[PDB]
Amino acid sequence: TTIVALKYPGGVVMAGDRRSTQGNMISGRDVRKVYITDDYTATGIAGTAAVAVEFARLYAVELEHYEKLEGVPLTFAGKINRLAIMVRGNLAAAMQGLLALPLLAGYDIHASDPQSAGRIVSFDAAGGWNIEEEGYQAVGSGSLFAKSSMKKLYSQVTDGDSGLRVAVEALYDAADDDSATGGPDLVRGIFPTAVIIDADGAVDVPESRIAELARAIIESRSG
Amino acid sequence: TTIVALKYPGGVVMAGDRRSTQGNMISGRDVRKVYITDDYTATGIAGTAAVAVEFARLYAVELEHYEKLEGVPLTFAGKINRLAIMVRGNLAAAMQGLLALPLLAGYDIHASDPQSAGRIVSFDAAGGWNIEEEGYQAVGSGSLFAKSSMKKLYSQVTDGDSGLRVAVEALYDAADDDSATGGPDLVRGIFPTAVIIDADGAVDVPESRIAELARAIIESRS
Amino acid sequence: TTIVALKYPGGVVMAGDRRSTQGNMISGRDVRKVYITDDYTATGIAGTAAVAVEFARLYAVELEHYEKLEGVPLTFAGKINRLAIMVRGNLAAAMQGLLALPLLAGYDIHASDPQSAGRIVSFDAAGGWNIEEEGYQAVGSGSLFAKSSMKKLYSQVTDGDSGLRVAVEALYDAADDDSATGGPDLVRGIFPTAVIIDADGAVDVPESRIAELARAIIESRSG
Amino acid sequence: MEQAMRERSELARKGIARAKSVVALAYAGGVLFVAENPSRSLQKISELYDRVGFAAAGKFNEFDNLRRGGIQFADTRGYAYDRRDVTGRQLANVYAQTLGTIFTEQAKPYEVELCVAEVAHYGETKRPELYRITYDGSIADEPHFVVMGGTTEPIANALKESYAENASLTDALRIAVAALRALGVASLEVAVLDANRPRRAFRRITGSALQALLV
Amino acid sequence: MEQAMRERSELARKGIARAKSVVALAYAGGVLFVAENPSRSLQKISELYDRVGFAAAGKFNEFDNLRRGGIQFADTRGYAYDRRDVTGRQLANVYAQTLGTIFTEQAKPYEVELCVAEVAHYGETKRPELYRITYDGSIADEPHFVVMGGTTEPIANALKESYAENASLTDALRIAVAALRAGLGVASLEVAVLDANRPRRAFRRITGSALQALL
Amino acid sequence: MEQAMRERSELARKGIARAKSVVALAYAGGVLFVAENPSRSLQKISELYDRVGFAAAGKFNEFDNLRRGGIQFADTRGYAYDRRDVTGRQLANVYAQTLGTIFTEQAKPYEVELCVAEVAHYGETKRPELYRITYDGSIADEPHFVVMGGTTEPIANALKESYAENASLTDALRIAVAALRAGSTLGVASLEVAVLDANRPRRAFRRITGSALQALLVD
Amino acid sequence: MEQAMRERSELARKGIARAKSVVALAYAGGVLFVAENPSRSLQKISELYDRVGFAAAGKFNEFDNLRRGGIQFADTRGYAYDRRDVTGRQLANVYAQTLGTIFTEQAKPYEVELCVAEVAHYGETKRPELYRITYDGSIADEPHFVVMGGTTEPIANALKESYAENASLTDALRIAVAALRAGSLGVASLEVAVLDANRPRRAFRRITGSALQALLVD
Amino acid sequence: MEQAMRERSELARKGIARAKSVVALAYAGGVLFVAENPSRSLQKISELYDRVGFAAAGKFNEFDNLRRGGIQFADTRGYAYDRRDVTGRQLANVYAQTLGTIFTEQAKPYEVELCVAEVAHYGETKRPELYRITYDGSIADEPHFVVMGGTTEPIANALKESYAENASLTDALRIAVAALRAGTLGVASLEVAVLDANRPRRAFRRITGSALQALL
Ligand SMILES: Cc1cc(C(=O)N[C@@H](CC(=O)N2CCC[C@@H]2c2ccccc2)C(=O)N[C@@H](C)c2ncc(-c3ccccc3F)[nH]2)no1
Ligand SMILES: Cc1cc(C(=O)N[C@@H](CC(=O)N2CCC[C@@H]2c2ccccc2)C(=O)N[C@@H](C)c2ncc(-c3ccccc3F)[nH]2)no1
Ligand SMILES: Cc1cc(C(=O)N[C@@H](CC(=O)N2CCC[C@@H]2c2ccccc2)C(=O)N[C@@H](C)c2ncc(-c3ccccc3F)[nH]2)no1
């Protein structure tokens, strides 16, 4: 699994691959690993599928629960805190193999400067969290290849289009060097999923757009 | 053990073998593993027998429990979530050896297109689940052989009877390569079981049709 | 220990040997291993003597308890369920050395066909149960000798007499190949025990009958 | 003591007296439940188990609590033993015990009157059973019909002078609706325990089908 | 204190007086229970243990409670030691204690009157035992018969006149239905016997054509 | 006992009598809640679930307790099963049960009157549902409008006279507010207004405040 | 407060008054228990421990509860220490405490009157001990006899005038029977037991049927 | 039931009518808390959270209990989530629920009346909020000020004709003291504090001693 998130002027993008493995066997070709968890927040997870789904559903239910009880959404710091608590509560199960790490992307509507309101938070199994202040981040088995690709590609990010482009290319390098990360399937027509967030909110990137970027990347690598 | 399920235009079909072993010894020739869990849902199980029977009985009782308490059946996502929660509940016993995984097949009466209302959901030991969108799936010690046969034989699925024939042939191959999966016993007259679910519900496939399909397969491979 | 049970037209018969060992020492010569649990069901157990006695007593008490409370006996399926739940209850102590498996033989007064109303139900340490549909079953350290003997002797079963005889002979073969199963003791007069169950209920077979059948088997194998 | 029981009995009796009426009858095809119910989504009649049905009159939340407790009892008992070990007499008994306890120990006694019915299993010939449990936990077995809630005397007498065993479905519906008026689709809830069904006997009769059955 | 206990004793007395009457007599074959019961499904006479039987009068849910409690106590006692150690005197004793606690401490005292009978085991020669336990936990030892529920005086008097030891089953049955008549066929009676002639379980029910034949 | 239950019923009834009125209407776009509320931050109407809304009249702390309990029930049921297995009828049912227990067992009965409303999921055809739950657990299904709080018979009789199915949002608002005042000068400073909008894809609850509410009221 | 205790003391006292009489009598062989009892199997007299016996008047289930409690206390103490540490004074003491708590705090007081008796261990010379514990926990040390239940004045005066310490079993028996008759009688309506100081360990012994009939007539 | 609830209600009402009076006002720099307090160390106005403060009238130990409860709630919630998630609306809600519960179930109802005020965070523009909760959990929202305790209507009148929005602190305290008199007050007889919206983190601040003397 590889999940990528990166900031661009006025928003943040997050994309993820579609592969599920069980040892070396391919147990999944169309897994959706990036969830819109509220109108301005999206969580993408890596690890045991059961813990990932429980994390996504329980987290979204928790956030909307708070804003329905109190008539106002949580601050972004509060969202980070609750997610960290949820990750920490799973530590015992994680030591026994049921390990899953999430990655947080969001748009803080209460931020002073809306151009840099984009937010990326990474987490570890201990609940420790870090707000990333260098632009991009990635979690999963191919996360090192992805971060190292984005280290060279990040200077190209100037808006949402270039941000999504760089994201899908980082996933491409992730699948290029990590057999547990799935690349574009031009035969079945399966591509990574993406969510983009700006001041208008969080939306799922349509399949055909990510397919366009993937084709451009492939033909670029073939020449 | 091998349970198979595949989608056909207008419904879904599931079939399972009859074998029980214990190490190498044959301890069962007539085990019925595909259950009609509700009017539009059938569950096949592979693994420890006690965990399997508990899963099927408790699961059907749970679905009907909700249906009678709230006057309406669960949505299909609800059924999936409940089953996955139960399988997750058995994770400690699973770690100590009492392992059993289900495969789900149902007809969603609230699906958009009635032809594509078939549903196949695979599960793992931690309650993770995947809705299979490639048409077929299998679980058990012979599931790889049955899936690799259905990969080549799925193109011949055009209606109910053809999908049932492909399911029986997949089980035949699984039994051909996995000594824990039982094949057709032509001497005793014991054949795999199968349930089919369409817009009119989930019905047991009569044994005679399974026997005829099996005889056609055997005759064709001789 | 070897316990056998088999169906015959209109009923069912169960029999068990009389041996108790610990290590290689004979510690018992007249153990009763087959119990009449209610008017139409008997259970024979193999394993730790304490767990076996507890199973049989507690099970008979359970059935008669339900019957007196609700004014009607449990359906045969319900009886199977309670027995299995009891075994699953003992699973842990079985994992630490107190293992004991039961074999259930009964007559279903509510069955559709009164001459095929005999029932053979086998169990395992985890509470799994299987209604046998091949005519015979056995449980114990000589169960495979007795089951393979019944595989050849079963076609001769046509009433209570024949079925009882092939039960005594299956026990004889088991005791012949398994030193933990006791054969007939002609010096002491101790012979295996048996229960027979028809539509008139479950009755114990007198020892002198099993002695007659035993001598018949012995001389039939002398010449 | 005697004052408190006087006030509990009277409170429950008046509360049931103010509620609408429900009738259950044995007919040739099983058991018929007919209840005066103007509501669209709220039910006075419910399935309990395979061949066992439930009807109730009085305060909705209370007999709905009891109805859910009955479903829990039947499902748990079936799973513990077997589906064919669950009887209507069992549910009647546990309803009598539970209702007695509620009547003596709860803050306010339940203002409910309950009926448990049971038809035969598919392919078996046994006659239906009708059980009536009152607010104080008193239980009684009726052979023909059960009237609950409201002014019971005119409905009871009407059935006594009109009831015939093994009546057809339409005859049972007309005799029941006639007995109640002592009433169309939008003001009636009707369901049957149909002994002709293989697995689950309970089924509602609503809408155009009920209209065709009415006239 | 005197106010409460007065009200409770008279509430239970009134409750028992309003219920139908039960009679139990020792005859040559064991013990005979006969109870006025128009129900086809609900039972006032039950089996407790191999040679121990139960007969109640009053409010059904309450003495069915005490009935299941007695069956529980009996089965548990027999499992902790042996079946043979369970005596009718034990059941009567714990019934006296139970009804004492209930009468003084429950929300409403139980409107019941219990009777526990014991016949001998098969090979043994032991005269029957009849115990009568009242709503306040009072326990009485009776050698010939026990009457419960309703207006007991005419029944106890008719029995005091017409009872002889070692009567046959039909004599005992007829004098019993006669004593009940002083304050009744198969359709309105429930009849059972603890038959000392049975090897294991003495309790047996006389119903249908057999009960009609005995009248 | 009987006297105690009588004076409990009277305490609750009189408490709701002195309370400001709330009404809920079925209309073309879904359901509309309008409530007499001079407050700025203390709300009487709230979102329950995706397509389920909530209205309340009476003592604020009590129906706010019930509001939170309803959100808890809905969210927990949705996590245990699916979001689509949560129905308005369920919330109304458990509200009847909870208000029954509260009415008979709490130290003081709840001086509250509740309404639960449900519209159709996006793209589906279903006429809205409206349920009224009384302080004693009494539940009732009503097809068009629900009035709670204060002197209700004038307001309800007004809606009986001026209700039209599938009326525009403007029409339903004017009819609702007209009936409100008819039961007893109001405006944006005295109204809390929201809708269950059957056109929104996911969350149907939507507040109409400020300039938009002013534009809707007067035309 | 004040009315509650008045109705409690009155309820318990009157409850004991309506019950049958029980007499416990120190005699040359030990202690003698005679009680009016029509029942064949329901008992008002019982063994407690080796040399300690129990008698009670009143409501059966209640003094039977106290009986079983006393046996439980005796057996538990004798197990925790030694049998030689269980004494009649201990049993009477825990009965005073227990009955005090019952009278003060039970939903209804116990309508019972208890006597605990102790003779000497075998081979030893110790005069018997009789303790009376009433419904409110009042404990009293009585020298020769104890009367409980019914109208105790006639029986108490009869025994006060006809008592002999060193009387035989037959003599003391017919004395107690004569006093019970004076307070209002054969085998079919009497329960009779004895704390026999001559038995080696368990002094308690019942006197039934033909043996008691032989003790009633010469 | 009803007469018992009115006995409780009146017990609390008479209790509060006998206690000293408290006023909390909105001014251009935040919120002002003025209370007649003869004590030197016992407080009727206190800090709850960064921008949320608390004033109380009635029996001391009871509104002190409630004050500690609100501090506990605020700190616990700010820890579970964020510090910005704590709002005066939330504390007024919890205080309402708590006082309703105490009024309906406690052995004796609390003879208290509370005010929870919140001002804007540093650098944010947002008009102050004032909430008033009474002995039975009744909650009311007030845009300008809250008067509670003792004979109230006299103080309320003076405020009705003396209040001016965006008044200076030096004007606002003088006005408040004037309203308190109607119903001579000096530093030795008063306790005063402010929610100073100009403060970056914690807005609550006591105005004591020589600084209060200079202010008056
Ligand atoms: C213990 C234990 C571990 C596992 C295990 O490794 N189970 C595998 C998954 C697996 O074999 N099966 C077969 C039946 C359904 C289930 C499936 C398949 C496909 C998709 C989603 C669930 C896993 O955990 N595989 C890992 C690599 C994985 N698969 C998907 C994710 C995932 C990650 C982030 C967000 C969402 C996700 F689904 N992770 N099972 O028990
Ligand atoms: C721990 C532990 C493991 C086991 C174990 O190996 N238990 C075995 C089963 C076994 O030895 N016995 C003998 C008595 C009844 C039971 C039986 C036999 C035959 C058929 C059905 C039940 C098993 O689990 N054997 C596996 C291969 C198996 N047998 C059936 C299934 C099964 C699978 C799917 C749906 C329903 C089913 F019953 N699975 N026991 O304890
Ligand atoms: C823990 C632990 C286990 C054991 C153990 O193995 N204990 C042995 C039994 C044993 O040593 N003793 C000595 C005193 C009575 C008891 C006995 C002897 C002979 C017969 C019946 C009871 C056993 O369990 N030995 C096994 C082979 C056995 N002995 C009888 C059965 C038996 C089987 C089925 C139905 C009834 C039965 F009694 N099983 N001891 O401690």
Write down the domain spans for chain F: 1-219
Nearest C-alpha neighbor of G138 from the set G108, G104, G87:
G104
Tell me which residue of D165, D177, D163 sits closest to D211, measured CA to CA.
D177
The domain defined by E1-215 folds into Glutamine Phosphoribosylpyrophosphate, subunit 1, domain 1 (3.60.20)
Tokens at A182, concatenated: 């799935």
- The H-or-E segment that residue E160 falls in is helix E152-162
Chains H and F touch (3+ CB pairs under 8 A): yes
Structure-token pair, residue H22: 């408290």
F80 CB contacts (<8 Å, ≥6 apart)?
Answer: B81, B85
SS3 H125: coil
Share of chain D residues as helix, strand and coil, in percent rounded to the nearest 5: 45, 25, 30
Q: Which two tokens stand for residue F82?
A: 């699916």
Q: How far is residue B170's CA from residue B154's CA, in Å, rounded to a whole number?
A: 10
| Three-class DSSP category at C128 | coil
Alpha-carbon span C37 to C57, nearest angstrom: 8
Q: Quick one: which of B111, B117, B62, B121 has its CA closest to B89?
A: B62
Residues of chain A contacting residue B129, judged by C-beta atoms under 8 Å apart: 49, 53
**How far, in Å, from the CA of A26 to the mean position of ligand 1?**
10
Lookup: tokens for E54: 């139960």
Residue C94 Cβ < 6 Å to ligand 3: no
Q: Are residues D15 and D58 in contact, defined by beta-carbon separation less than 8 angstroms?
A: yes
- Which residues have a Cβ under 8 Å from the Cβ of G68 and sit 6 or more positions away? none
- Ligand 2 binding pocket (C-beta < 6 A) is B 1, 20-22, 27-28, 31, 33, 45-46, 48-49, 52, 97-98; C 122-126, 128-130
Q: Quick one: tokens of G198?
A: 């001559």
**Ligand 3 pocket, residue C28 CB under 6 Å:** yes
The identity of residue D189, as a single letter, is: E
CA atoms within 13 Å, Cβ hemisphere of B204? 11
3-class DSSP state of A41? strand
- Are C210 and C172 contacting, i.e. CB atoms less than 8 angstroms apart? no
Look up residue F166 and give its DSSP letter: T
Nearest alpha carbon, ligand 1 atom 21: B130
Would you state the structure tokens that stand for residue A19, as one six-digit string?
């592969």
Closest by CA to A44, choosing from A155, A159, A174, A162, is: A174
Residue H139 phi/psi, 5-degree rounding, is -125, 135
**Phi, psi (rounded to 5 degrees) for F205:** -75, 135
Q: Residue F146, class by beta-carbon neighbours within 10 Å (0-12 exposed, 13-18 middle, 19+ buried)?
A: buried
With b for 16 or more beta-carbon neighbours within 10 A and e for fewer, the B159-184 pattern comes to ebeebbbbbbbbbbbbbeebebbbbb
Residues in chain A: 223
Q: Which letter does DSSP use for residue H209 in this model?
A: T
3-state helix/strand/coil string of chain B: CEEEEEEECCEEEEEECCCEEECCEEEECCCCCEEEEECCEEEEEEECHHHHHHHHHHHHHHHHHHHHHHCCCCCHHHHHHHHHHHHHHCHHHHHCCCCEEEEEEEECCCCCCHHHCEEEEEECCCCCEEECCCCEEEEECCHHHHHHHHHHHHHHCCCHHHHHHHHHHHHHHHHHHCCCCCCCECCCCECCEEEEEECCEEEECCHHHHHHHHHHHHHHHC
Query: Going by C-beta distance under 8 Å and a sequence separation of 6 or more, which residues neighbour residue F14?
Result: none
User: Half-sphere exposure (CA, 13 Å, Cβ side) for C108?
Assistant: 21
Contacts of D70 (CB under 8 A, 6+ apart): D48, D54, D91, D94, D95, D116
Tokens of D131: 């059980």
**What's the number of CA atoms in the CB half-sphere (13 Å) around residue H82?**
14
Residues D174 and B146: their CA atoms lie apart, in Å, by 58
Of B84, B127, B130, the CB nearest to A28: B130
Tokens encoding D16: 């049931």
Q: In a mutational test of the pocket of ligand 1, which residue from A27, A36, A55, A143 has the highest number of ligand atoms less than 8 Å from its CB?
A: A27
Residue whose pair of structure tokens reads 């008698």 in the numeric block = G55
- Under a CB-based contact definition with an 8 Å cutoff, are residues C171 and C140 in contact? no
Name the residue type at position G76: T
What is the CATH class of B1-222? Answer: alpha beta
Classify E56 as helix, strand or coil. Answer: strand
CA distance D74 to D83: 9
The pair of three-digit structure tokens given for residue A33, joined into one six-digit string: 């690993």
Query: Do F75 and F82 touch, CB atoms closer than 8 A?
Result: no
Hey, how many other C-beta atoms are within 10 angstroms of the C-beta on E209? 8
Spatial CA neighbour of G216 closest among G172, G158, G153: G172
Are C168 and C26 spatial neighbours (Cβ–Cβ below 8 Å)?
no
Q: Residue written as tokens 């003397």?
A: H213
What long-range pairs does C56-65 form, CB within 8 A, spacing at least 24?
C57/E79, C58/C86, C58/E79, C59/C83, C59/C86, C60/C35, C61/E75, C61/E78, C61/E79, C62/C86, C63/C37, C63/C38, C64/C38, C64/E75, C65/E71, C65/E72, C65/E75
Give the residue from E84, E97, E98, E142 showing the smallest Cα distance to E116: E142
Annotated active-site positions of C, please?
Answer: 1
- SS3 per residue for B32-51: CCEEEEECCEEEEEEECHHH
Instruction: Count other Cβ atoms within 10 Å, centred on residue A159.
Output: 12
Contact, F116 vs F133, CB < 8 A?
A: yes
CATH code of the domain occupying F1-219: 3.60.20.10
Does C49 contact ligand 3 (Cβ within 6 A)? Answer: yes
Query: What H or E segment, with its residue span, contains residue A122?
Result: strand A118-123
Residues in chain F: 219
Report the SS3 class of residue E204. Answer: strand
Residue D54, both tokens: 């439930």
Helices then strands, counting H and E runs in chain A, come out as: 6, 12
CA of C184 to the centre of ligand 3 (A): 20
Binding site membership of B122 for ligand 1 (Cβ less than 6 Å): yes
Contact E12/E109 with Cβ under 8 angstroms? yes
G93 token code pair: 């003491």
Taking CA G89 as the corner, what is the angle to CA G87 and CA G95, rounded to the nearest 5 degrees?
110
Distances (CA, A) of B168 to A58, E101, E163: 41, 67, 77
Tell me the residues of E at the D interface, defined by beta carbons under 8 Å apart.
4, 7-8, 10-11, 39-42, 59-62, 64-65, 106-108
Distances (CA, A) of F38 to E9, F35, F186, H140, H147: 60, 9, 9, 10, 19
- Residue partners of F170: CB distance under 8 A and separation at least 6: F216, F219
Q: In what order do the strands lie in the sheet with G204-206?
A: G145-148, G22-27, G30-36, G190-196, G204-206
Q: Between helices D169-180 and D152-162, what is the axis angle to 10°?
A: 150
Q: How many whole angstroms separate alpha carbon H17 and alpha carbon G218?
A: 93
Neighbour-count burial for B127-140, b at 16+ CB within 10 Å, e otherwise: bbbbebeebbbbbb
Structure tokens at D107: 């803050």
Instruction: Transcribe E61-119 into DSSP letters.
Output: HHHHHHHHHHHHHHHHHHHHS-GGG--HHHHHHHHHHHHHHHHHHSSS---EEEEEEE-
Strand partners, B16: B3, B193
> Separation of C102 CA from ligand 2 center, angstroms?
15
Q: What is the resolution of this structure in A?
A: 2.9
β-strands A11-16, A2-8: how paired?
A: antiparallel
Cα separation values, A208 from A193, A218, B198, C18, C108, Å: 11, 15, 33, 77, 65
Helix (H, G, I), strand (E, B) or coil at E168: coil
H/E element, D123: none
**Cβ neighbours of C77 in D, within 8 Å:** 81-82, 84
- Of the candidates E193, E12, E32, E4, the one whose C-alpha atom is nearest the C-alpha of residue E112 is E12
D206 φψ region: left (φ > 0), alpha (ψ -120 to 50), beta (else)? beta
Q: Which two tokens stand for residue D75?
A: 């499902």
The CATH number for A1-223, chosen from 3.30.70.3150, 3.40.50.10420, 3.60.20.10, 3.10.20.740, is: 3.60.20.10
What single-letter DSSP state applies at residue A192?
-
- What is chain G's alpha carbon radius of gyration, rounded to the nearest angstrom? 17
DSSP, res A59:
H
Residues of B with CB under 8 A from a CB of C: 20, 25, 27-31, 48-51, 53, 98
H with G: touching (≥3 Cβ pairs within 8 Å): no
CA torsion F165-F171-F176-F177 (nearest 10°) is: -170
Which chains contact F through at least 3 pairs of Cβ atoms less than 8 Å apart? Answer: A, B, D, H
Judge: domain H1-216, CATH 3.30.930.10.
Answer: no
Is residue D25 within a helix (H) or strand (E), and if so which, with residue range? Answer: strand D22-27
H helix count then E strand count, chain F? 6, 10
Paired tokens of B106? 């149902």
For residues E71 and E66, give the distance between their C-alpha atoms in angstroms, rounded to a whole number: 9
Q: Looking at the DSSP assignment, which residues form a beta bridge with residue F130?
A: F117, F142
Residue H180 to residue H17: CA distance in whole angstroms: 14
Q: Which residues contact A200 (CB under 8 A, 6 or more apart)?
A: none
Residue to mutate among B68, B69, B203, B204, with most D CBs inside 10 A, is B68
Distances in Å between the Cα of C173 and the Cα atoms of B27, C16, C220 are 20, 13, 13
CB count in 10 Å sphere of residue D187: 11
Alpha-carbon torsion B59, B61, B62, B63, what sign? Answer: positive
DSSP character for H178?
A: H
CA distance E103 to E68: 18
Tokens of F177: 């507010």
| Amino acid at residue number B111 | A
Instruction: Locate A129 and state its tokens.
Output: 């969290």
- C-alpha A158/C-alpha A13 separation (Å) is 13
Strand partners, F52: F49, F118
Using the Cβ of F91 and the Cβ atoms of chain A, whether some distance falls under 8 Å is answered with no
Q: What tokens were used for A152?
A: 């060279």
Integer Cα distance of C24 and C6 in angstroms: 30
If you compute the radius of gyration of chain F from its CA atoms, what whole number of angstroms results? 17
Contact H86, H203 (CB under 8 A): no
In contact, C176 and C169? CB cutoff 8 Å: no
Sequence-distant (≥ 6) Cβ neighbours of residue B26 within 8 angstroms: B19, B20
Tracing tokens 């009880």 back to the chain, one arrives at A69
What is the distance of C-alpha A176 from the center of its chain? 18
Inspect the interface and report whether the beta carbons of A81 and H84 lie closer than 8 Å: no
| Nearest Cα to Cα of residue G53 among G77, G25, G15 | G25
CATH topology classification for G1-218: Glutamine Phosphoribosylpyrophosphate, subunit 1, domain 1 (3.60.20)
User: How many Å lie between the alpha carbon of G201 and the closest alpha carbon of chain E?
Assistant: 26
Which residue is it, tokens 């040559």?
E28
d(C-alpha D90, C-alpha B96), whole Å: 39
